Amino acid sequence: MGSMERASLIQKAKLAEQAERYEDMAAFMKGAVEKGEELSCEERNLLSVAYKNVVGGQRAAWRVLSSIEQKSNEGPEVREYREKVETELQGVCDTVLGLLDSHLIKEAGDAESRVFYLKMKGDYYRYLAEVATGDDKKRIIDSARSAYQEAMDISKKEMPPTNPIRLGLALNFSVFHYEIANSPEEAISLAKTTFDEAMADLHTLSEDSYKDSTLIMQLLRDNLTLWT
């Protein structure tokens, strides 16, 4: 997207979101990142929404195909096609991780941007871990853990307990513990402590911030209900 203006890329990313054209959205936001300027709060959300939708569809397809493949192991086509989808998913994750590494994270100095990008890094390594089976699943898991942990450390020092980025980070890190790291007790403890500390901070918030925070706290509660 080298020949398109940064502002035009951002504008078209917003149009693509309205049209539910998430592959286009991601390509526009990739082009905007590669302009080399830092991203605003809104622009970070556009980047995240775009790739989350793209990889979300790939993950859903991979799970359908992985399930069919497992039922068959109780021609090569099902394995071959699952492998095709898996490779495409890995390529998208690698692309996002490449954007974070070149050079979003190193230029992110404010807590809001740095925690946002590191949560992103944890998420896309988590997606790689979901399909990993070889000699590097352990290394991929530790890469996810390390990103989430650095983001947690910053968010606990620099953000209030009700901050939606801090809450969503804790939510996804708890899902990492439960689903990836085989640490359901750590997952439950993190979700509980996150929820309780947010509840105690709600009195400080405006009506609109209250709605933002309580929405994510309900997601923590939904998981705790499923896990206990």
Binding site: N45, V49, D123, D222, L226
Partner: peptide, 9 residues
């Protein structure tokens, strides 16, 4: 177990 939906913004 639900992660952040993050599909709309």
């Amino acid at each position: 177990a639900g992660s952040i939906p993050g599909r709309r913004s």
